């Protein structure tokens, strides 16, 4: 499953939409990729720092208190498990 997110966003708050093509339990993770390392910013499970609202097959993710922020979406159940990892969103705080 492909996950689309904006390549660039400008902000202390930054919001971006994360969209996936689901074929009922979804798990959303925001990962920050620094150097060649990955940190967890945000995580939540929904069953159709961070603020997440689900409108259909998309999640509106707002980060606050502000790099490459990777949107990760998982279809957990019913099987099959699906993993989607976005190309990442560059956020510019200035």
């Amino acid at each position, epitope marked *: *499953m*492909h*996950v689309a997110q904006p390549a660039v966003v400008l902000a202390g708050i930054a919001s971006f939409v994360c969209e996936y*093509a689901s074929p009922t*339990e979804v798990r959303v*993770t925001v*990962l920050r990729q620094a150097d*060649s390392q*990955v940190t*967890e910013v945000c995580a939540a499970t929904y069953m159709m720092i961070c603020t997440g609202t689900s409108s259909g097959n998309q999640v509106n993710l707002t980060i606050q208190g502000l790099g490459l922020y*990777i949107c*990760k979406v998982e279809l*957990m*159940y019913p*099987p*099959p*498990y*699906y*993993l*989607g*990892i976005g190309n990442g969103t560059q956020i510019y705080v200035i």
Partner: antibody
Amino acid sequence: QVQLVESGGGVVQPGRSLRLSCAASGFTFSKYVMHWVRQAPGKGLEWVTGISYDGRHKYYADSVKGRFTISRDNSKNTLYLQMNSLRAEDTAIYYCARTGWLGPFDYWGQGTLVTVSS
Amino acid sequence: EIVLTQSPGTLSLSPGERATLSCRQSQSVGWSPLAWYQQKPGQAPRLLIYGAFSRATGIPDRFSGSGSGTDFTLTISRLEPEDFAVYYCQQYGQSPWTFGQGTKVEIKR
């Protein structure tokens, strides 16, 4: 330093049962999908079963569905494989593997050998 | 169920030469959750590449991956003696997690 150490392998008679354990350390066990992957002698890698972060979701290869059961204890930081109805073709090295947050199997145990023979 | 097919079955090369390994998957996923593993005899598999082209931690520069869609390639730019082993590709985008059947990189003589 991530470590995964499998134990419990040995010789088992057909039709019987065996429990494997994978003791994890060096990472927050609860935050990763865990798997069992096996390799029969002279053959390739075959994914057997995996289990979600919290233990609530279990996924199985058709080859073992209904015979093998995966579980995890996120306090002991241990992964389990309960093998029932064992068959000669289940003879394999059984590896414990961690799923990186970006998806691949980024750490593997050294494996434990299960030999199914009468 | 995504099936991975590797080619060739065996590559026969000498140290210092370039190794090109192919992996084809039965359907595209919209992205590349495609990993490569190395396995030396009597040793567990070791992750080399994920996301088609990203190097795993501690993996040397000579290993690189490329491709997209259904068509992926692992390249070892200049083989070292420790690189003669079996290499597996894998898709990790959906269950069941599936592997290619492996490619042996052997010493040519």
